[PDB]
Amino acid sequence: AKIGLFYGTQTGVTQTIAESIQQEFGGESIVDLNDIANADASDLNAYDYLIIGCPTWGVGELQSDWEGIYDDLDSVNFQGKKVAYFGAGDQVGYSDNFQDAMGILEEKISSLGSQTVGYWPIEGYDFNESKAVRNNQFVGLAIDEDNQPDLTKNRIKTWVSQLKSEFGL
Numbered sequence: 001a002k003i004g005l006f007y008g009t010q011t012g013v014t015q016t017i018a019e020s021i022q023q024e025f026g027g028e029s030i031v032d033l034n035d036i037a038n039a040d041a042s043d044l045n046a047y048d049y050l051i052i053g054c055p056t057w058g059v060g061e062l063q064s065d066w067e068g069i070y071d072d073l074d075s076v077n078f079q080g081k082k083v084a085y086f087g088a089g090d091q092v093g094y095s096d097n098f099q100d101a102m103g104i105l106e107e108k109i110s111s112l113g114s115q116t117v118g119y120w121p122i123e124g125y126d127f128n129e130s131k132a133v134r135n136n137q138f139v140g141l142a143i144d145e146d147n148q149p150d151l152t153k154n155r156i157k158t159w160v161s162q163l164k165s166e167f168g169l
């Protein structure tokens with residue numbers, strides 16, 4: 001497929017979101033779903049457009065599978081690639097570290113010459129601090145199944161619609 005979606009998940013929520021994103025884009029013919037747990041960093045080279053999904057765990061840390069491949073990101077040719085991000089988090093329980101993992105990945109990947117695409121507004125959330133916030137916006141789609149599960153479907157629908165422009169669709 002033209003778009004490669006790489007996600008990591010601990011309790012399965014992020015995988016469910018990844019599947020919904022794939023569906024909104026039009027299915028398997030448009031977006032490839034790849035669990036980062038089973039991927040080599042080089043797998044990310046095969047796509048010109050990437051979607052990176054990662055939930056935040058351990059109080060402001062990356063999900064373990066993303067943590068494992070983090071050091072190899074440096075060897076990937078990210079130059080000129082457009083990359084979008086999404087993450088699952090809990091704004092009530094972790095108000096000071098909401099969506100930090102998504103922020104950690106974007107900071108690293110954007111520093112390797114890629115172009116971040118898919119900024120999202122922070123106004124629909126209530127949190128104190130987040131490493132995923134840049135200039136009053138999230139670097140990607142923030143999903144909260146723990147406190148706002150009823151907003152998930154429309155958030156994905158809206159975000160994908162916005163992404164289609166950026167990915168030449």
Ligand SMILES: Cc1cc2nc3c(=O)[nH]c(=O)nc-3n(C[C@H](O)[C@H](O)[C@H](O)COP(=O)(O)O)c2cc1C
Pocket residue numbers: 008009010011012013014015055056057058059060061063088089090091094097098099100145146
């Ligand atoms: C022990 C624990 C730590 C967590 N830490 C964070 C955190 O630091 N920041 C955040 O935004 N959410 C945090 N969460 C919420 C999870 O990211 C959230 O439940 C998410 O849906 C899990 O996604 P997954 O099923 O794809 O692994 C944590 C949840 C638990 C139970």
